[PDB]
Amino acid sequence: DITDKNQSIDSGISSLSYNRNEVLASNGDKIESFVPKEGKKAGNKFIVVERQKRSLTTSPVDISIIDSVNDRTYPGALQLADKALVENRPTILMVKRKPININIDLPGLKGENSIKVDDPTYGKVSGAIDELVSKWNEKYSSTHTLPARTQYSESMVYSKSQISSALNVNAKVLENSLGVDFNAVANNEKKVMILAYKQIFYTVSADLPKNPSDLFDDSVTFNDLKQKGVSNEAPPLMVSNVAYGRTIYVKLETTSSSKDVQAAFKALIKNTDIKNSQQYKDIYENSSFTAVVLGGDAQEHNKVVTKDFDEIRKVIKDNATFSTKNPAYPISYTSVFLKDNSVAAVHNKTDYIETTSTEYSKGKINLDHSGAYVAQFEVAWDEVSYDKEGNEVLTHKTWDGNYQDKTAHYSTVIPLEANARNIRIKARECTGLAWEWWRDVISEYDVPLTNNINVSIWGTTLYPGSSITYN
Amino acid sequence: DITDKNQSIDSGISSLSYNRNEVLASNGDKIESFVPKEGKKAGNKFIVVERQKRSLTTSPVDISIIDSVNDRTYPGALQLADKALVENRPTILMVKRKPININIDLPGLKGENSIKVDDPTYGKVSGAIDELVSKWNEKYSSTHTLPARTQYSESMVYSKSQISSALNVNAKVLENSLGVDFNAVANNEKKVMILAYKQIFYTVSADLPKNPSDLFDDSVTFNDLKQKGVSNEAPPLMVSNVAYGRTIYVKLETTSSSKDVQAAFKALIKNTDIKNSQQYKDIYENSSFTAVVLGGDAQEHNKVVTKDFDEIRKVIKDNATFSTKNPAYPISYTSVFLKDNSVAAVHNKTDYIETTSTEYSKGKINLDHSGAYVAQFEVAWDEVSYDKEGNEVLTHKTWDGNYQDKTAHYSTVIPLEANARNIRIKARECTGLAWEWWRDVISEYDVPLTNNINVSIWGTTLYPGSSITYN
């Protein structure tokens, strides 16, 4: 009852003035410079990258917990709403408290899933929760394990801020546990996909009080609260919901810049036949998969790194069971503002560059002339690039052996760069006055660029023959 | 020997001053305004068009003849080099002439393929040519038909100027004979491909004179020449080469805006197995093929319009033979400047917009819930468009039945627009406290948009089941 006139925990709390939708919000990198299209050579390949700008907005109410077995979050706790909470390390507030009622959502306990906790402390609520679970176990004595409520998330990685908001996890967890090379992703040197299998055993909620005072023992004053950190930019909160279980995170990673990485990946998780295709097996040959289990009942820093996804499938399969007789730890939670008793949400807004690539490979044209006549060739093609504007630039090339007599068995190779386009191969027999009035033995336009383009000409002057194959 | 001091056909001609590389050149539409990317709905489809600017340069020396049997072009004729010549209707010059030597390139007549033509007139050179051909026929009396020297050209159509320079034909011939809808092509309402099978029977050349005077009878004065049209922008020329035969033009046309039209077309001409694929047969169902034969031995305005390419194959096959006993007509020719006796070339330069499209089709999501439990869905997706800058704009949509209990057998359809993207379908069983802590029964992201997306959920509360199929 300071010289402040806010001297009733209720008025002290009610007279707080804050924007509930702006106190817990965080806007990630808001950024602006890039090239729309790009052509890059790397080894025996040509990568074409395209960039769009995208924007993601989120307002999760379910907040991810970092240190599962050290995070002393419990239903009915008091926290401050600020940047610390948003950084997954909220400030707790301890004071003498009035009892609180807790409820667990396990199935088949309707009507007997509540318990009053006189002294609401991490340890004393944990015991109450344990009581509740024992009750369920007493009722269903021969059911020692239940399926976990799995929630599946999936997404490609483009930026630290994009993927965190997308999966609703601290970026540190992905960078540290799965080890995500955000710079490789940025330079499109690696394409990464991240899966998240959230395994919820059950959740426990605390009955919302109709007045902030009902939570606090009467010896606690609004002063003690401000002293503890309550203010306009640090509004008081109560944990109303806590989810218990564990999470399986998976990273699929490749050096392929192929337009089919996401589908190839997708095919592998689903185990659809398409995964046996060869454009996919090639990508799989240059991919690696990592799986880590975080949360309850997992020895910290466990990890699996493989090239055989079946090992990943095993980790997903093995960690979806909930043993009702073994301890469980908080995995996430939701909070309510003490003021209007409304659910607290963390607002995130962030732009990011979305990249889509295509991978081209070097190839060669193989000419074979076994025809009983003199012939001349004309081989031409363009080499594509992209100016700063992302616009195409074509540079015309031609085989130095064009328009030159070739007789009974000639063999050559005309290597092509991975960025070769508008490829045309022509061969004319030499009966007539000149090139312009000579018979076509083979005439191809827009020959698709592959590993090997095999052109062969044979036959007689009267009846030449020819074919073009690919590899 | 006017008051002009140019009084010797040789000096009169030698004192002419002109740019040989600029007198016969024509620059087609040089143009500048367009949108890089565009999204267009048409029926139950969404067409995405992309535009690049391209530039084509040509310098043909072989000049296409328009009216095969009315074109009195003959080896050893005199023409003016100007815009008329470039318009495929050159100005001829007649005067008393000194003899000229002609040579035909038919095989097996080496040493006896020449003849002197005392009075070089269309009719008198035509007879000499006929003499030469009779000589060949006398030598090879039992060979009445020979294969024609076929020259194959192929190209997609983008603009009147682009296709003319590409195929080296008068645009009128394609617009008039094949009937090309250049406005439909422009609005990408029709995709057209044009083939050209030039059938050369033989060519006849005239020996170049070492002096302009040697061509002219001595009674002809430089005055008569100027009077006839010779000038600095109308330099004198002699026809040095004439090709005889006919040409088969083919048009492949479709209303499909599919990214596979060119490959589908290509597959059909080659008759490669890929043509039996279904993405190709669909395109073929919306295509039409036209074939016309121009030139010698064809009744004017003949034409074939079909949906069965085998009919086209027949016209190509049937018109490749050269009957040595039947008359032949000029199909093209080359000219030499009288000044430096150099080969005349028509220089063309033209820009054009190259368009590449992709066709998307409408689809629907089919939900079937036959599970022994209450479930809730979450269906969301974006609808893409493109701003004036060609940039993507995403508009988020959601099924109005999201987050609402659905029980023992529910069925629904969620139609999607052909521009639907980032499609996600989720279903959760309702055991728990709320949506956020409910078990996933199905969770898909980036579901490819097809005709039918069939999602079905069943099973028990403990063990739900689900699947997603496509059509």
PDB file of C-alpha atoms in Angstrom, chain A residues 37 50 52-54 61-62 105-107 110 146-154 198 200 203 205 241-243 262 266 270 332-334 354 390-392 394 422 426 428 431-441 443-448 461-463 468 470, chain B residues 37 50 52-54 61-62 105-107 110 146-154 198 200 203 205 241-243 262 266 270 332-334 354 390-392 394 422 426 428 431-441 443-448 461-463 468 470:
ATOM      1  CA  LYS A  37      17.674 -15.765 -60.473  1.00  0.00           C
ATOM      2  CA  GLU A  50      15.374 -18.723 -57.924  1.00  0.00           C
ATOM      3  CA  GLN A  52      11.046 -15.241 -53.769  1.00  0.00           C
ATOM      4  CA  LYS A  53      10.456 -13.285 -50.578  1.00  0.00           C
ATOM      5  CA  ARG A  54       8.000 -14.880 -48.168  1.00  0.00           C
ATOM      6  CA  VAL A  61      -0.269 -20.458 -27.339  1.00  0.00           C
ATOM      7  CA  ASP A  62       1.503 -23.763 -26.691  1.00  0.00           C
ATOM      8  CA  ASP A 105      -6.624 -35.174 -19.406  1.00  0.00           C
ATOM      9  CA  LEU A 106      -5.915 -38.921 -19.380  1.00  0.00           C
ATOM     10  CA  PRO A 107      -8.793 -40.878 -20.919  1.00  0.00           C
ATOM     11  CA  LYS A 110     -13.764 -38.440 -16.173  1.00  0.00           C
ATOM     12  CA  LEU A 146      -0.412 -46.389 -23.919  1.00  0.00           C
ATOM     13  CA  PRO A 147       0.149 -44.942 -27.385  1.00  0.00           C
ATOM     14  CA  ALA A 148       1.408 -41.374 -27.197  1.00  0.00           C
ATOM     15  CA  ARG A 149      -0.545 -38.608 -28.912  1.00  0.00           C
ATOM     16  CA  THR A 150       1.774 -37.927 -31.826  1.00  0.00           C
ATOM     17  CA  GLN A 151       1.782 -34.537 -33.532  1.00  0.00           C
ATOM     18  CA  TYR A 152       3.742 -34.395 -36.774  1.00  0.00           C
ATOM     19  CA  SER A 153       5.349 -31.269 -38.219  1.00  0.00           C
ATOM     20  CA  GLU A 154       7.397 -31.082 -41.404  1.00  0.00           C
ATOM     21  CA  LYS A 198       5.780 -34.483 -30.660  1.00  0.00           C
ATOM     22  CA  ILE A 200       2.214 -36.095 -25.715  1.00  0.00           C
ATOM     23  CA  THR A 203      -1.492 -32.643 -20.082  1.00  0.00           C
ATOM     24  CA  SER A 205      -4.227 -27.887 -16.237  1.00  0.00           C
ATOM     25  CA  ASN A 241      -1.495 -25.996 -19.036  1.00  0.00           C
ATOM     26  CA  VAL A 242       1.532 -28.273 -19.207  1.00  0.00           C
ATOM     27  CA  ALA A 243       2.046 -31.033 -21.785  1.00  0.00           C
ATOM     28  CA  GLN A 262      11.649 -32.319 -51.310  1.00  0.00           C
ATOM     29  CA  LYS A 266       8.796 -36.878 -48.871  1.00  0.00           C
ATOM     30  CA  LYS A 270       6.161 -42.148 -46.573  1.00  0.00           C
ATOM     31  CA  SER A 332       5.483 -27.466 -23.445  1.00  0.00           C
ATOM     32  CA  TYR A 333       2.895 -25.293 -21.697  1.00  0.00           C
ATOM     33  CA  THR A 334       0.402 -22.434 -22.016  1.00  0.00           C
ATOM     34  CA  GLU A 354      12.544 -18.986 -50.340  1.00  0.00           C
ATOM     35  CA  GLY A 390      18.164 -12.507 -63.132  1.00  0.00           C
ATOM     36  CA  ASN A 391      17.684 -12.255 -66.895  1.00  0.00           C
ATOM     37  CA  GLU A 392      18.968 -14.885 -69.305  1.00  0.00           C
ATOM     38  CA  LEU A 394      22.809 -16.706 -74.271  1.00  0.00           C
ATOM     39  CA  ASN A 422      19.336 -24.839 -77.700  1.00  0.00           C
ATOM     40  CA  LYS A 426      23.019 -31.603 -88.273  1.00  0.00           C
ATOM     41  CA  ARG A 428      24.627 -33.398 -94.609  1.00  0.00           C
ATOM     42  CA  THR A 431      26.291 -34.633-103.276  1.00  0.00           C
ATOM     43  CA  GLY A 432      25.404 -31.306-104.875  1.00  0.00           C
ATOM     44  CA  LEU A 433      27.002 -27.924-105.431  1.00  0.00           C
ATOM     45  CA  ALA A 434      27.495 -26.676-101.864  1.00  0.00           C
ATOM     46  CA  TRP A 435      26.397 -26.949 -98.211  1.00  0.00           C
ATOM     47  CA  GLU A 436      23.157 -25.043 -98.883  1.00  0.00           C
ATOM     48  CA  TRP A 437      22.019 -27.594-101.477  1.00  0.00           C
ATOM     49  CA  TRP A 438      23.209 -30.789 -99.804  1.00  0.00           C
ATOM     50  CA  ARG A 439      20.963 -33.537 -98.474  1.00  0.00           C
ATOM     51  CA  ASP A 440      20.247 -33.763 -94.726  1.00  0.00           C
ATOM     52  CA  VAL A 441      21.353 -37.096 -93.183  1.00  0.00           C
ATOM     53  CA  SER A 443      18.771 -32.713 -88.547  1.00  0.00           C
ATOM     54  CA  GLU A 444      17.903 -32.188 -84.897  1.00  0.00           C
ATOM     55  CA  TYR A 445      16.897 -29.098 -82.962  1.00  0.00           C
ATOM     56  CA  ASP A 446      16.577 -28.544 -79.242  1.00  0.00           C
ATOM     57  CA  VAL A 447      18.317 -31.843 -78.483  1.00  0.00           C
ATOM     58  CA  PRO A 448      17.858 -32.386 -74.726  1.00  0.00           C
ATOM     59  CA  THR A 461      24.821 -41.761-101.045  1.00  0.00           C
ATOM     60  CA  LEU A 462      21.379 -42.646-102.407  1.00  0.00           C
ATOM     61  CA  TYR A 463      20.056 -43.929 -99.101  1.00  0.00           C
ATOM     62  CA  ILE A 468      20.347 -40.359 -82.181  1.00  0.00           C
ATOM     63  CA  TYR A 470      20.718 -40.890 -75.236  1.00  0.00           C
TER      64      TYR A 470
ATOM     65  CA  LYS B  37       5.337 -13.636 -65.289  1.00  0.00           C
ATOM     66  CA  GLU B  50       6.848 -16.553 -68.412  1.00  0.00           C
ATOM     67  CA  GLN B  52      12.040 -13.601 -71.939  1.00  0.00           C
ATOM     68  CA  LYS B  53      13.204 -11.297 -74.714  1.00  0.00           C
ATOM     69  CA  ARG B  54      15.217 -12.991 -77.445  1.00  0.00           C
ATOM     70  CA  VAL B  61      22.268 -16.475 -99.158  1.00  0.00           C
ATOM     71  CA  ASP B  62      19.710 -19.015-100.378  1.00  0.00           C
ATOM     72  CA  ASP B 105      24.752 -30.555-109.903  1.00  0.00           C
ATOM     73  CA  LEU B 106      23.088 -33.910-110.624  1.00  0.00           C
ATOM     74  CA  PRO B 107      25.314 -36.807-109.558  1.00  0.00           C
ATOM     75  CA  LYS B 110      30.869 -34.898-113.880  1.00  0.00           C
ATOM     76  CA  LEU B 146      15.709 -40.399-107.447  1.00  0.00           C
ATOM     77  CA  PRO B 147      15.457 -39.542-103.756  1.00  0.00           C
ATOM     78  CA  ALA B 148      15.181 -35.801-103.230  1.00  0.00           C
ATOM     79  CA  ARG B 149      17.746 -34.020-101.072  1.00  0.00           C
ATOM     80  CA  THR B 150      15.611 -33.323 -98.023  1.00  0.00           C
ATOM     81  CA  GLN B 151      16.448 -30.438 -95.704  1.00  0.00           C
ATOM     82  CA  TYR B 152      14.511 -30.406 -92.445  1.00  0.00           C
ATOM     83  CA  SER B 153      13.741 -27.302 -90.392  1.00  0.00           C
ATOM     84  CA  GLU B 154      11.732 -27.195 -87.177  1.00  0.00           C
ATOM     85  CA  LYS B 198      12.678 -28.795 -98.410  1.00  0.00           C
ATOM     86  CA  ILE B 200      15.823 -30.312-103.661  1.00  0.00           C
ATOM     87  CA  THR B 203      20.445 -26.945-108.629  1.00  0.00           C
ATOM     88  CA  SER B 205      24.427 -22.430-111.568  1.00  0.00           C
ATOM     89  CA  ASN B 241      22.214 -20.457-108.392  1.00  0.00           C
ATOM     90  CA  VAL B 242      18.694 -21.853-108.579  1.00  0.00           C
ATOM     91  CA  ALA B 243      17.409 -24.820-106.560  1.00  0.00           C
ATOM     92  CA  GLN B 262       7.053 -29.136 -77.582  1.00  0.00           C
ATOM     93  CA  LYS B 266       8.676 -33.733 -80.915  1.00  0.00           C
ATOM     94  CA  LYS B 270       9.898 -38.972 -84.240  1.00  0.00           C
ATOM     95  CA  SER B 332      14.985 -20.861-104.165  1.00  0.00           C
ATOM     96  CA  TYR B 333      18.095 -19.149-105.534  1.00  0.00           C
ATOM     97  CA  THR B 334      21.240 -17.157-104.741  1.00  0.00           C
ATOM     98  CA  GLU B 354       9.703 -16.101 -75.977  1.00  0.00           C
ATOM     99  CA  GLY B 390       5.649 -10.931 -62.048  1.00  0.00           C
ATOM    100  CA  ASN B 391       6.083 -11.533 -58.319  1.00  0.00           C
ATOM    101  CA  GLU B 392       4.094 -14.144 -56.421  1.00  0.00           C
ATOM    102  CA  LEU B 394      -0.216 -15.806 -51.795  1.00  0.00           C
ATOM    103  CA  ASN B 422       0.920 -25.062 -50.064  1.00  0.00           C
ATOM    104  CA  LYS B 426      -4.673 -32.508 -40.878  1.00  0.00           C
ATOM    105  CA  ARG B 428      -6.856 -34.990 -34.960  1.00  0.00           C
ATOM    106  CA  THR B 431      -9.006 -37.371 -26.647  1.00  0.00           C
ATOM    107  CA  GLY B 432      -7.321 -34.758 -24.467  1.00  0.00           C
ATOM    108  CA  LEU B 433      -7.992 -31.246 -23.239  1.00  0.00           C
ATOM    109  CA  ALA B 434      -8.050 -29.258 -26.489  1.00  0.00           C
ATOM    110  CA  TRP B 435      -6.969 -29.110 -30.155  1.00  0.00           C
ATOM    111  CA  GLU B 436      -3.361 -28.281 -29.215  1.00  0.00           C
ATOM    112  CA  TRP B 437      -2.997 -31.486 -27.183  1.00  0.00           C
ATOM    113  CA  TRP B 438      -4.939 -33.880 -29.402  1.00  0.00           C
ATOM    114  CA  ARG B 439      -3.456 -36.816 -31.287  1.00  0.00           C
ATOM    115  CA  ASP B 440      -2.729 -36.504 -35.027  1.00  0.00           C
ATOM    116  CA  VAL B 441      -4.628 -39.075 -37.146  1.00  0.00           C
ATOM    117  CA  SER B 443      -0.872 -34.722 -40.929  1.00  0.00           C
ATOM    118  CA  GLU B 444       0.195 -33.759 -44.434  1.00  0.00           C
ATOM    119  CA  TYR B 445       2.024 -30.731 -45.772  1.00  0.00           C
ATOM    120  CA  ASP B 446       2.573 -29.583 -49.325  1.00  0.00           C
ATOM    121  CA  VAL B 447       0.050 -32.105 -50.653  1.00  0.00           C
ATOM    122  CA  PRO B 448       0.448 -32.025 -54.455  1.00  0.00           C
ATOM    123  CA  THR B 461      -9.396 -44.076 -30.228  1.00  0.00           C
ATOM    124  CA  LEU B 462      -6.342 -46.073 -29.148  1.00  0.00           C
ATOM    125  CA  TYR B 463      -5.317 -47.006 -32.670  1.00  0.00           C
ATOM    126  CA  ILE B 468      -4.231 -40.335 -48.590  1.00  0.00           C
ATOM    127  CA  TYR B 470      -4.550 -39.421 -55.497  1.00  0.00           C
TER     128      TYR B 470
END
